[PDB]
Write a protein that binds this ligand. Structure first.
Ligand SMILES: [Mg+2]
Ligand SMILES: [Mg+2]
Lengths: 545, 545
């Protein structure tokens, strides 16, 4: 809570001019020779804003062309599910995608009545389609997640239903930039009217199959029976009709605390930094729902692409790590059809409460570097029952151990909290309190500082031997890691562990800086000692960089 | 109220998708040969919606080109003041105008910071500019007035500051449609960036000079001294910053009841027909302010272009026709510099209360046909002190009898209500009560019935001798009119008068029907006898063909 208007309702002065920004998509163009305006198409696709010359018609035409080409080269001939969120720029982007996909002879499936579609609803659609064993489906999701109102995003999900990885994204990025440099000569395009008349664009209801399918992944009958008073802040996002449909279809006492869809997102409370950001895990952004927390047994919210979740109880907004540990602890004791081998995916900076829970359940922990990409294959083939990120995104398998969404799914994570409460009679925070009473209440913190460009490079080229420390804050070190133990993938940094605590140091992805994540099960003072020693270790190893 | 939800707050389901509509401006086009998609550029300019292929980039490019050409032909080489309202489609239309005007070498003056500008602010800017006597300025107002959120409009005001008349609009319309049929070949256009770099687009604050200028038309010192508690619903329109600046500059106890600017206009109460229409004279649309009316001595609202006014007191929303009479009766007794050479304008269908007031004051009444256009020249040369129309639009002179706005001005009409209240100690409704006591309370109504295109044609080609009746509802007929007595212009219908009442019949311009406006100073029963006989007279004079 840094900003002085953090947590306060947005004011008119905070808001964008939606129609102007949308005009800018068409009338402004990336600058020849300007790297800031180029396509940057990564793990979350390409994001930017029309007013900054970084999310405009030429970008989306170029990206859509590159995706059409790539998918064809990869032998994908089934439909492309194209979903969009509630950001303003998702509308012009969606149209550009249809124009180019249809021109390249791609069969596109869209939500009818220009509706909105969660990331996991695209993932789920792809998976359900491909299970049929015919021509392969893939998809595009037109969202910048929880970015502010002026931003747009677009990303690709290949036939395994998860985010595209760098083997695809880099080729797409280079191709799109080549097309921009070429004045879009290589872009094939037809008018929106022609695309709709072409037969290549099919409008369907994606909502009902997804909503009815939930019964195959969450215990909707136990939820119904419990008769809980449930609340949701849809945060003006892409799954607002999904929540309404879930309440209707499952006859739940589930109340939307507001039902606003507004491309200025003016209904939002401002985030910690005074911006309008639809972050379901942020206390400031969640101030609206938190002021009503006493009215519900359980409440929740989702970011605009509905791949992330925030869990509220009368006690407040749960810490996302705390919830992951509780979700895992519950699922692995309440999913008998999951094979003995089905494993638990965890990122290296997530809480070691996860480790403790997993060890207690006699289940395999597969620790991976940060990034949901590391869970996709294991969710897909059913070897990971669960994969989550401490950034409040996770997914888990259907009851029968087959995948539901291989991208993160905020809806199943929220409904899982309701299942937990219903089946056990205790909400997820009460469950966390019991974990803390059993194992101790860990103290977690993140630090950051500048590094020179050379130091930042050095930090990602360490070897365990470069670290001679044998103790960390009074305990014997049990591991010094530069690769994730679960999958052997490089951390691009360092993790050091003891039985009582750990730290991980990683370069920042966007600045010449590094971050240190650390956690102690002995408390605040012990954690502060870990911090001091982590900084000492990192300084020593980068001293010559 | 006709619609079940009239006067209710809009629901989400009532709202447009702003970015989609704005995208349609660019990606949809009018259908070649389809008259419904053609430019229709009349008294209010051209209005339509991008979603109906009637307000899209090609229309605006074509109209801007036609205006550039027409103004040059008419010897206008000073700047063009280009103002816009708060409708979504005003944003892309604004950009289109800039691109074409700059391409044509036209100097353009705009409100700084992409701000919004009332119709009368454009009119005033033109007049103030041209009083300096160099190259002539003109203007464009990008507004569809109070039309629903999905609509756009654009209209032209020549150097006399008033709405363009048919001698100009018909020519602009033909040229625009020729350009459309010609695939925009004769349209000169440069990019928005080029237009901004060209030096042809100058941004200024139009607000401050307008606000400071008000002291030369309304008695702001008297209003200040009275210390009234005033309220305003800006109705998310183009003058919202004007009301704020007025309050601050003149140190008034004037509160905005909301300060929303929202291209969905979701804050509105639904109009009589369930649409979202920003009509300041509609009780349904004004339900929000009316709910708050006990909080203020006097309150105001304006339609999005701020050329019309709504006057509220604790008794409710004033009937616009009543307010005109009150405005005239007050002004001509509180404007000593408007000598005997300054007349009162009145349209054909306005109340005969105006006749009574004007006679009582020993002033000249100039009765004109329906249409504000008939007041422009008289306002411009000072020979008309005031001219208003029944739909709550009017203007009047500065204190010294020179023009302020030759288009309708909502701001001066709202502030006049405050001046009346401050100077006299009686609000405008209280003044109407006194007029009713002096002259009787007239009973006014409008009737309509079906008419063949042929009967409507006959209706407009009548002569006084065709009305053989010598009495109307028991009184001798004192006038049988087919031309307006004040300026001799054809009325395109018939008006019959006695000392106690009158009716006027005109063909409908939008339906196969005729309309009869009727009023009696004897009361409702007498008015109904006037109706009966009017229908008989109309039937008779049209029994022909
Ligand atoms: Mg997200
Ligand atoms: Mg208007």
């Amino acid at each position: 809570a840094i900003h002085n208007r953090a947590g306060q309702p947005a004011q008119q002065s905070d808001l964008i001019n939606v129609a102007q920004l949308t005009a800018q998509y068409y009338v402004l163009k990336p600058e020849a020779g300007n790297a800031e305006h180029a396509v940057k198409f990564g793990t979350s696709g390409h994001r930017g804003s029309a007013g900054r010359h970084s999310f405009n018609e030429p970008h989306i035409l170029a990206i859509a062309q590159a995706i059409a080409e790539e998918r064809a080269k990869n032998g994908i001939t089934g439909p492309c599910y194209v979903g969009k969120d509630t950001h303003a720029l998702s509308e012009p982007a969606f149209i550009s995608v249809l124009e180019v996909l249809a021109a390249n002879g791609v069969d596109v499936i869209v939500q009818e009545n220009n509706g909105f579609t969660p990331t996991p609803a695209v993932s789920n659609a792809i998976l359900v389609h491909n299970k049929k064993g015919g021509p392969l489906a893939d998809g595009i999701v037109i969202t910048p997640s929880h970015n502010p109102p002026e931003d747009g995003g677009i990303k690709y999900n290949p036939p395994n239903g998860g985010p595209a990885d760098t083997n695809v994204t880099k080729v797409v990025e280079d191709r799109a930039n080549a097309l921009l440099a070429g004045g879009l000569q290589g872009v094939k395009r037809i008018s929106l009217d022609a695309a709709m008349a072409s037969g290549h664009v099919k409008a369907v209801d994606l909502v009902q199959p997804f909503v009815e399918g939930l019964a195959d992944i969450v215990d909707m009958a136990a939820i119904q029976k419990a008769g809980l008073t449930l609340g949701v802040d849809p945060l003006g996002g892409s799954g607002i009709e999904y929540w309404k449909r879930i309440a209707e279809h499952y006859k739940l006492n589930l109340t939307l605390v507001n039902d606003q869809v507004d491309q200025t997102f003016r209904f939002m409370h401002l985030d910690k930094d005074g911006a309008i950001r639809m972050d379901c895990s942020s206390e400031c952004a969640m101030a609206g729902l938190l002021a009503l927390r006493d009215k519900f047994d359980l409440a929740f919210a989702n970011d605009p692409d509905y791949d992330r979740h925030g869990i509220v109880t009368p006690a407040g907004l749960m810490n996302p790590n705390h919830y992951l540990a509780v979700a895992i602890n519950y699922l692995f004791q309440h999913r008998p059809l999951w094979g003995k081998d089905v494993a638990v995916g965890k990122t290296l900076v997530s809480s070691a409460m996860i480790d403790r829970v997993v060890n207690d359940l006699g289940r395999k922990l597969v620790e991976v570097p940060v990034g949901f990409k590391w869970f996709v294959d294991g969710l897909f083939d059913g070897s990971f029952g669960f994969g989550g990120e401490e950034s409040a995104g996770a997914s888990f398998l259907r009851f029968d151990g087959t995948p539901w969404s291989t991208d993160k799914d905020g809806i199943i994570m929220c409904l899982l909290a309701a299942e937990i409460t219903a089946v056990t009679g205790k909400n997820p925070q009460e469950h966390y309190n019991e974990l803390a009473a059993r194992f101790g209440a860990p103290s977690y913190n993140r630090l950051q500082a500048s590094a020179t460009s050379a130091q930042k490079a050095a930090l990602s080229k360490l070897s365990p031997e470069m670290v001679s420390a044998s103790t960390l804050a009074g305990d014997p070190i049990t591991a010094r890691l530069t690769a994730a133990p679960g999958n052997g993938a490089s951390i691009g940094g360092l993790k050091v562990m003891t039985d009582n605590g750990w730290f991980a140091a990683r370069p920042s992805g966007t600045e010449d800086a590094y971050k240190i994540y650390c956690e102690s099960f002995l408390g605040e003072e012990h954690r502060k000692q870990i911090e001091k020693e982590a900084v000492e270790i990192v300084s020593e190893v980068l001293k010559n960089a």
